[PDB]
């Protein structure tokens, strides 16, 4: 939870927010790339891009 929340603190709030939404942590649903896209005003591919960068970010430290 908090160890998680502070663990998602090395990324931009946007990268973090992309992950939380993908994993259902914000509202209970595991949103699709398109849904997160529409949230951020960009395509599903750019969300894919961001998510990957974020995962690689927390899997190196």
């Amino acid at each position: 939870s908090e160890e998680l929340e502070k663990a998602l603190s090395k990324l931009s709030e946007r990268e973090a927010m992309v992950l939380k939404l993908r994993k259902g942590l914000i509202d209970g649903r595991e949103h699709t790339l398109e849904e997160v896209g529409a949230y951020f005003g960009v395509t599903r591919e750019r969300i894919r891009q961001i998510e990957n960068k974020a995962l690689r970010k927390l899997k190196y430290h």
Binding site: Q49, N52, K53, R56
Partner: protein, 96 residues
Amino acid sequence: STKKKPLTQEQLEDARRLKAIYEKKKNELGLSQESVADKMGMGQSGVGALFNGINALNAYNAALLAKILKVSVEEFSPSIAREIYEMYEAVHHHHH
């Protein structure tokens, strides 16, 4: 606007050889332009610009790419390989 200046023919040949190695080995090495980029500290489009002869290789990126692809720099750019050798001569403390 203001299109990017074309690289030299030799640079373009370097890149074509680079990309061809990439295409030939990506499946077995399990790479994507994206995963390669990450190993290099950069983004996918940046690596792509290098593979497609749009952005110039430097010695650092060439070496990085050679290590990732498991080939010698000599396999895509002889001139960058010679440049690196030239620089290596300079770490040699030599005799008395």
